[PDB]
Every structure is written in C-alpha cells, then in structure tokens.
Design a protein around this ligand. Sequence first.
Ligand SMILES: [Zn+2]
Lengths: 109, 349, 45, 57, 387
Amino acid sequence: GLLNLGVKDIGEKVIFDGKPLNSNSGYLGNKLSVSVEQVSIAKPMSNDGVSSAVERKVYPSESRQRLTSYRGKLLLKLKWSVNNGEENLFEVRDCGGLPVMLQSNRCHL
Amino acid sequence: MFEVPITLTNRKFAQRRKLKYQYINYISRRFDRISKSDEERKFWKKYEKPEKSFEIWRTVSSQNKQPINKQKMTYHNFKKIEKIPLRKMEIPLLHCTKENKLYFQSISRGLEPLKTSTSEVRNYRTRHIVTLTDLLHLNVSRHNWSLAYKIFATLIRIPGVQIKSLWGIGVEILDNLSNSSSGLDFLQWMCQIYSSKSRFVQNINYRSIVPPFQTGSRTHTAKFAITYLWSSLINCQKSMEPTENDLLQELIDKISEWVLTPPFMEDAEVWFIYASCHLLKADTLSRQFVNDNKNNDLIGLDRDIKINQVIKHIHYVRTFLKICLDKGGFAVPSRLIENQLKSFESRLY
Amino acid sequence: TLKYICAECSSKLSLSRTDAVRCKDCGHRILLKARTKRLVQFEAR
Amino acid sequence: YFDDTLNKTKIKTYHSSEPAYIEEVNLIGDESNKFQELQTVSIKYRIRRTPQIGDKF
Amino acid sequence: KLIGHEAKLLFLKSFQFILKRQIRWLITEMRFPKEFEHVAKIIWLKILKTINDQPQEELKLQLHMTSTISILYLASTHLSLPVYTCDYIKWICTAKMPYFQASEILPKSWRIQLPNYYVSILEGSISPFNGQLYNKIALTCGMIHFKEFFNSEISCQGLLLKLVMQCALPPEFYFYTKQVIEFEETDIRNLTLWERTDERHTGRVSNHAELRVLSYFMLTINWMLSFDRDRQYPLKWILSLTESLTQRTTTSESIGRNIVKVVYPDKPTSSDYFQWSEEETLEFLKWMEKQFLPTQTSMEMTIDQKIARRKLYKIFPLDREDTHQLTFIEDLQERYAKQTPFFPPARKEAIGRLLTHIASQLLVDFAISKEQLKDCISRIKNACLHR
Ligand SMILES: [Zn+2]
C-alpha cells in the first residue's frame, strides 16, 4: 500500500552519540540508525478498564451517538538499528487513533 | 493426584520459600565469593527468566563453553562454604514454625518432601475441588463423555478455576462430547477471555499462574489462541471440496484483525497457520476449477478469470510462507510445500 | 420504575444513582431514555 | 442537577425563539474510565416547521 | 467496620443468628416440637450469661465453627434424640446445617459489619480434627455446667443400634456389647456426657462416652469372636461379612460417608476418592450440582466480570446438556441376606482383617487419632482386667 512505500522512502535518521572511545575521534564509532519498517492500521476497537477486557468492534453509529471521533489504532514497526547492524531492535509502537474512512478497507462497514 | 485449580493456601509455603531462598542467596554468595520476600525477588534477578515456553531449551549446538574445573568439590570445600550460611538461617529458623524448622533442615540436607502441599490443605471448598479435578482426569482417561462433562461443568461453578485445565480439558471434553459445542466457541470465548494484549513477564513471584498455558498478549503466545486457529482450519476442511459458507474467510479476517501486535508481532504458525488456511483456499479453487480441465471439456467460459484469481493467491501465499521463514521460523519444511504447490500448479494448467 | 434502554442490546433497565452508566446485559455505554405513559395535549394541526 | 459546593438544585435552561419537543435523551458514560455519575447527556429537540409566508420554495 | 467491644457485640449477634437458623432446620429435619427449640435457646442464653460477666474487654468468646454444633449436640443430648457421628455425617451429606458457610446470616450487612477480629472468621473456616470435635463440647460443658443442668448425658441405646446395623448387623452383638457395657462400662450404667473440662489444656481423659462405646463395640467383636469356643460364628462366616461389606452404594448414607471422606484427611478415604465405584462417581456429581450451588450467590466489576461469567456458564450450559437406587434398610436387608448362609491362624487374621475395617468406619465419622482411638482402646483394655 502507498503508506508502506512512503515509510520505505523516508529511510533512516542517523545519530552519533559522539561515540567517545578514546579515526576514533572523528570517526566517532557511535552509529545509531533509526527507521520505520512497517506501518499497520487496525479497525476501530474499544477495550475498557484497559486490556483485561473483552474487545468489541466499534461502529460508526457509536461514534456519532457518542459525538466522538471514529479512530483506529495506528501501529508502526519501529526499527532501532545500532552500529549500522551491530544490533537490531524491533518495536511495534501504537501511535494513537488515526481516523479511518467509512466503507474503506479499514471500516467495519 | 492431579493439578489443582487454585492459589496455593498461602500460609506456610510462603515462609518456607523465604527460608529456601534466603539460604540460597547466603550459600550462593559465599560461592560467588570463594570464586573471586526481596531475597526471593533477588534470586530471580540473579538468573533471568524462562521466557515464552517452559524449559529454556535452546539448541545444543553453537558455543562450546568448555566446562571442566576438575569437579572442584572436596567435601572439605563444601563445608567451608556451608558452615556460615546455616548459622544465619538459624536466626530466622527460630522465628519459624516447628514444621518449617525441619522442612528447612530436610531441604538443607538435600532431602525432598514426599508430603505434597496439596495433600493436607483442610478447606471445604478446596478439598472437594481436589476430588473433582481428580474425577474428571480419571474420567477422560477412560473417555466417559456423559460424566466427564458433568464434573467439568461443576468444577468451573465452584470459585476455583483459572482457565487452567478448563481450557485444556474444556476443549478435550467438547471434542469427546459428540453433542453440544465446538471447543471452537469455547476456544473463541477463551481468546477474548485472556487476549492479555499487555506484554507482562518477570517482575513479581508468579506462583499463582505459571503455566505458559494461560497468559500472553504481550509477546509470549497464548496456546489456546493458537489452538483456536488450528481447530478452526480443521473445522473449515471437513466437508469442503469433498453464502452460508464464509468460515475460510471468517478465519482470513479474524487472523487479519491481528496482523502483528502480539501475534503478528511474534512470528510463526501465526504467519504459518495463516498461509496454511490460505493454501487450502487455493486448492478448493483449483478443485472448483480442476477435474478434467476445470470441471471438464475446457472453459471457453470467458478467459479463466478463475486462473488469475488463483495465481494471485498462489503468489501471495508464497509471500506469507517466505516472511514466516525469514523472521526465524521454527516449523515449516519449505521443500515439501514448494513441491506440493508446483505440482498443484500443474493441475491449474 | 424509571427506564433506560441499551443503545445496542435493546434490553430494558432501570438505572440508579448507585450503578455504572452501562448496559448490564451487553456492556454498552449509551442508553436511550425510554418513553412512558405521560400525558401530552396536542392541537390536531 | 445538584452541585454539593452550592447546595442548590440547578437546571440548564432552554433558550430559543420557539418551542420544541424532546425526541431522544441519550446517557453517555462512554469513552470514560468510570465517570459513573452520568455527566454527559445528549438531548434532541424536535422543532416543527409548518409552511409559512416567507418560507422559500 | 467496627473494632473492639461493639465489633464483638455483633460478632456475638451474628453467632446468635446462625445458630438459630441451625436450630430450625433442626426442627424441620427431626420434627421435635417446641421442646427441641426452647431448650436450645436457653442453652445459649446460659452460654451468653457467662460471656457478659468476663466482658470489660473480654474477647475470648467468639465461638469456633464447632461450638455451635456442640451447643446443638448438648441440647439434643438433653432431649437425647440422637448421636454424634450420625448427626455429623448426615449434616455434612445434606449440608443440613448452614454450618459450612457463614454468608447466610441475614447479614449482607453483618458481612460488611467488617470483620473486627470476628465476623469474617465466622461461618465455614475448616473441617474438624481428631477430638477437636469435642475438645470444645467439654469446654461448653465447662462453660455450661451442663451435666448438673441436663439429664442423661451421652447415652442412647440408639447409637448401639446404629452401630450394629452399621454393618455386621449381628443382632446378638447389640446386647453382647450392651452386656460388656453392662459390665465394667461405668458400673453397668449409661455413660453420661463428660464434664466441663474447665482447664485449657484439654487433657485426653477419654471421658467422651461414645468414644468409649465404640471402644467396647470393637472389643466385644474381637473378644466374642476370638473365643466363640462353641464355634457359633463359622470360620468362613467372618470373611463373608467382610466381602459383602467392603463398599457398595447407599440409600443416601454411604453416599454421605463418601462426602465426609472427601475432607481428604489422613488418606483412609482418599483412595476411595480415586476408586469411587462408578456411579458413586455419578450420584456424587448429582449431589454437587444440587448442594454445591449452595456455593456462592465478582461485585461491581461493571457487570463485566460477572456477565462474562454468565456467558461462560451459558457456554458449557449443560446440567443435562429401580426410582433407581435403594434406601438404607433395603441395603441393610440385602447384605444381611448376602450372608444368608449362616446355618487357626487364618481366622485370627480374618478377625484382625475385619476389625481394621470397622476401625475405619467408626473412626472415619469421628476425630479418629489413628491411635488415640486405640489410646482409647488401650485405656479400657486396662480398665477391664480388674475382675
Ligand atoms: Zn445492551
């Protein structure tokens, strides 16, 4: 999908901790490459009291009656690459509720 | 004799633990040296956790950590380490019950207790429950369906059931119960009854629910949720290809509602089971367009729109099988599935 | 008995100042206040 | 409603040029963590509009 | 939520309450008119008398789970309607008593009356160990000065009957044992309930009359059987009485004794647990689906935790996703017939074989002491040889 191509195009954001090491003084030796591999979107759900509850599908009728937004959990697989590959870290981070379009591939209808 | 549904009468067992650990950190320490409540939490902080399974089984082939150190145990050397931790166990041994004094003096000699803590508890509610948990297990060990169901149904109405054997004998009794229910329903009720989408491991003394057989929704798979999907694909297979259908789609959309977080998030059968449901959806469509060129003499029947719908799928399923391998798979014998899929493609020609 | 219908299960109920604003039969958090036998006059135009 | 700080029975008045009728009253505890006091209510007013001189057609 | 004296007053009150509920089921089960009811009242009126006196801030009272039945036991003894072991087994089997769980009350509120070193400890804490059952009956007699107040304590020619029918209904053994009782059993006089063991050490003086009745019962069988010189009881006859017995259904009774066995104590019935003769298995689950419901009713939980629960039960729904079994005297008759055939080292072994069995039975209804029992046995053994 277009969004995964977009995140494949943003690439990396590199930062060097000023790798002290005591080339090791102008080649640092402190590479940190941060990127985003995947981006996932989930259909609207609401769990109350937090987690320990049974989840229910959230419908547009609910968002209208409640006079609230119709949000889907936005998740994105964060890639935390250390020393250009010395250490790879994956994390699925939840980025709050992205409003989903009705009758789209992300609305229950 | 079998595993009981309840938090273990927390009375003497909790102070026996104190004395066990406190001795192990004392004796352990003076070893750690001669090689130069909290104390139970510190014991677990001194050797990590077991993760998502049972026994930190991991290979047998990589690092040859050459372990020799000649044995290093001169009866004389053990009693140098031990002579001081035992006198420091006394001070708290005094403050402990006469039963826990010798319980400690037994395990510090290396004797093990033939007195199962679950063979003494004296509580009304409890003890019955031991009778029911044992009756049900003796009734499935002879397949008594009509009686195992009654004991199971009473066992959960009594206040002492943590999914436990309820999810592991509650599906076994509904497969053996030729009558009402598809472990499935019960399996899908469980899935919603402990998604535990929260990544909780380690920290506190899990001694109320150890069993990687209830828990998860963090990382550590749930095995009733994996069994729900496996039982669901086997429930789709029976009498397909032998609008009220949907099931093989219901399972494509119920596994998609996931698409990693905890399950997608973690790899394997999640991906693999999905592809397997997807691979079955490819056959069924080759059958429904197979026998003697589709059904028979040709198709003329506009293009083969049906071949293109199937080749799209076959190409997709090879993507799901590949990402399941790449991400460290643990169960797909790729050679056989690729040969089956190519020979099955031959049918589509 | 005052009445409140669950917006999603249709189950009638009678909320009190001492209960959670939730459908006790489904778990919904939206309740339609039920109509009752209450007199209203109307000019027929 | 009643606020303990004011020890008074207060009301939200209806302010309009014309009368209406209450069509639906919906009690909202939703999106809340507990909020059991039922502090959000949605009230729908029905205003009938008879064709009248000056109405556009 | 009350601590101290008034917390105690309602802990007192609640105790007051459940005993009364206990007594009225008492009447319905036994239909023993005003009489059973009023004697029981004043008994506790008498018990209350002393509690007030050592008050000030005396909190030694809060009676144990057992004190209540000791009270009903003492009062019955007055009336001398029944027996202890029988009463206890019957009560457990049918949950006749509200004894097991203390949620009943009329408390809802007494429940919340917080616990205050009390109310929570009441109703259903644990099942009795050894004497322990009486280790308080004596104390109550102590509090009560019961023997002076009430006539004929511990007695019952009915416990003997209960016991002979209990198994080897050997009609003759009723007055065999009645005779040895006649003998040195308190100078041929009906054993009265022991005294008000005032002392807190609760020494094992074994004056609990029944305990001795069972002892004479066992002894009688052994002696009489040991020396039946005339050979009135055939070699092959003794084991037959054993083969016939070793288990079987029960027109309610044996099913009950299974339910008591399931306090899984010293492992004498534990294995019965294991074995549990087929149906015994079945009528067990029946009695669990009827009398375990007397189980319970999480609170609040937004209906949520509860609903889910309801659904789950909706799920396994179940409870059905010669009237066959027989009565007590039917079973009794049929094994008395199963021995229908009446008219060295081995028999001694068989006799010991049989005595262990009864030791199991009589001991199992009661506080046992896989040796006090015999300590008890030992005692009168000694008592006897002063002819
Ligand atoms: Zn509802």
